[PDB]
């Protein structure tokens, strides 16, 4: 047997005292005991570790992952698509599926959108993205993402002694 170097803060194959696997590790505020050497969780999974040599506590957290969604306006109209990575901060993602990212990166509450432009207008929801965000294909034409609107705005002229009566039907 032999030994190698000790790296931190990057989710890589860890092998602390035999125990193998993968995960990212950061600092922690927890106390082991002199007879304590290994951590656990609510569902039989390692949480923290004690260095077999340096004798301090680190943790374990597997790398990020999640689903992938493709948003398309239909092959009949165009051939452009947008990609949504569910539940992952994409300032922290850079592997599977597409190996090449791009520009026009928008951060939402249900992941982050790649290849779509964010505008300030408000239309009806065409393709539901989530958390109040929708997407559409519009004009040079491209895919845009916006916040859905609830309808027109009007106020009823309520008054002390005013009543409106119809004069014709349909």
């Amino acid at each position: 047997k032999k030994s190698t170097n000790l790296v931190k803060n990057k989710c890589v194959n860890f092998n602390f005292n035999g125990l193998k696997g993968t995960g990212v590790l950061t600092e922690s505020n927890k106390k082991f005991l002199p007879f304590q050497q290994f951590g656990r969780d609510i569902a039989d999974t390692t949480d923290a570790v004690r260095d077999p040599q340096t004798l301090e506590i680190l943790d374990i957290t597997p790398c990020s992952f999640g689903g992938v969604s493709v948003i398309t306006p239909g092959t009949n109209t165009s051939n452009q698509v947008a990609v949504l990575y569910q539940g992952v901060n994409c300032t922290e993602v850079p592997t599977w599926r597409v190996y090449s990212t791009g520009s026009n990166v928008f951060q939402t509450r249900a992941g982050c959108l790649i290849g779509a432009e964010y505008v300030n207008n408000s239309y009806e929801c065409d393709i539901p993205i989530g958390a109040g965000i929708c997407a559409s294909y519009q004009t040079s034409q491209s895919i845009i993402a916006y916040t859905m609107s609830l309808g027109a705005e009007n106020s009823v002229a309520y008054s002390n002694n005013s009543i409106a009566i119809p004069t014709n039907f349909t």
């Binding site: 993968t22 957290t61 999640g66 689903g67 992952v88 958390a131 609830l150 309520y158």
Partner: protein, 336 residues
């Protein structure tokens, strides 16, 4: 004049599953042995997607009734009636009424909003929070399409329409009418001549205000009063926790770790153990999916009833006995 309340569930939590990570994990040989099966995960994904879209359809059907946004006039005088306990409060940053706050502070959700994004469960933070532990097995929770700032807008629009235009806004254009005349119209509807209201307006207004204050106070000093809206959260949490905990079982295999079966042994006898583990976990997933389907059907029935009540009690006056409250119906007001 009596004011009663009725609580109705409308939707449950959207969920997604992943066989590749849950069943096997980071083992390619187990992935190949799972690919050996024809198709036992396309159906699960399809069913969960159907449930997820059905929840949004339920919410949209119940709440998105009128495609207009009415606003109450700046001067809040309605003939002595005093609706400040159900109209939105501009003082708070959230635009919720002083009653919706009580309904929101008495239900303990799992995680309001979604800020995790696999960037919060870092270090010792993971494996202590329940949400991180669930998210680290292959189970994710999707956010709803309509946030909590739009349902409040819908309810406020409905309230403004029903207190500034009667029931005429649910059958065409909105036509304004003074409130002490809408009251007379409703009194004539139930079978009492309209001069009773015009001669007892002050007493009726005082009784209405007292009833509103009474329910506002009594919604807090009560043991539960909200079990229907808590049972959905409790059931979802319990089901997810059981599904996560099911991984520790052996199902007759020599070990519960996939890395001690593929390795530490030979293929011809490790195939049996891997097959046993895969079959057990697949059966657990199937049981979870079937339970979710049944619960979704029940929630759909409840949402249909809620939509019917919203259409009939609020947007009009109902002559059905014991449908919209107990007694002779006058009107109703919605809250989220």
């Amino acid at each position: 004049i009596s004011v009663t309340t009725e609580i109705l569930p409308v939707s449950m939590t959207k969920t997604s599953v992943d066989c590749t990570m849950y069943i096997c994990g980071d083992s390619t040989e187990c992935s190949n042995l799972l690919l050996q099966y024809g198709s036992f995960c396309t159906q699960l994904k399809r069913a969960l997607t159907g449930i997820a879209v059905e929840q949004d359809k339920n919410t949209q059907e119940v709440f998105a009734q009128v495609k207009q946004i009415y606003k109450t006039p700046p001067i809040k005088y309605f003939g002595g009636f005093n609706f400040s306990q159900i109209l939105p409060d501009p003082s708070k940053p959230s635009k919720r009424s002083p009653i919706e706050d009580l309904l929101f502070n008495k239900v303990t959700l799992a995680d309001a909003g979604f800020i995790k994004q696999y960037g919060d469960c870092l270090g010792d933070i993971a494996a202590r929070d329940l949400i991180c532990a669930q998210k680290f097995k292959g189970l994710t929770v999707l956010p709803p399409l309509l946030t909590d700032e739009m349902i409040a807008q819908y309810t406020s629009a409905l309230l403004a329409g029903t207190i500034t235009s009667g029931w005429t806004f649910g059958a065409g254009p909105a036509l304004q009418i003074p409130f002490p005349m809408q009251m007379a119209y409703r009194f004539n509807g139930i079978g009492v001549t309209q001069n009773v209201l015009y001669e007892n307006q002050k007493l009726i207004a005082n009784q209405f205000n007292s009833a509103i204050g009474k329910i506002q106070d009594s919604l807090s000093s009560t043991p539960s009063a909200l079990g229907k809206l808590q049972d959905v959260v409790n059931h979802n949490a319990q089901a997810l926790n059981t599904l996560v905990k099911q991984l520790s079982s052996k199902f007759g295999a020599i070990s519960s770790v996939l890395n001690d079966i593929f390795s530490r042994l030979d293929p011809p006898e490790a195939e049996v153990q891997i097959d046993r583990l895969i079959t057990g976990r697949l059966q657990s997933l199937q049981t979870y999916v079937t339970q979710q389907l049944i619960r979704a059907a029940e929630i759909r029935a409840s949402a249909n009833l809620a939509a019917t009540k919203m259409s009939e009690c609020v947007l009009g006056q109902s002559k059905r006995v014991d449908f919209c409250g107990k007694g002779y119906h006058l009107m109703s007001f919605p809250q989220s």
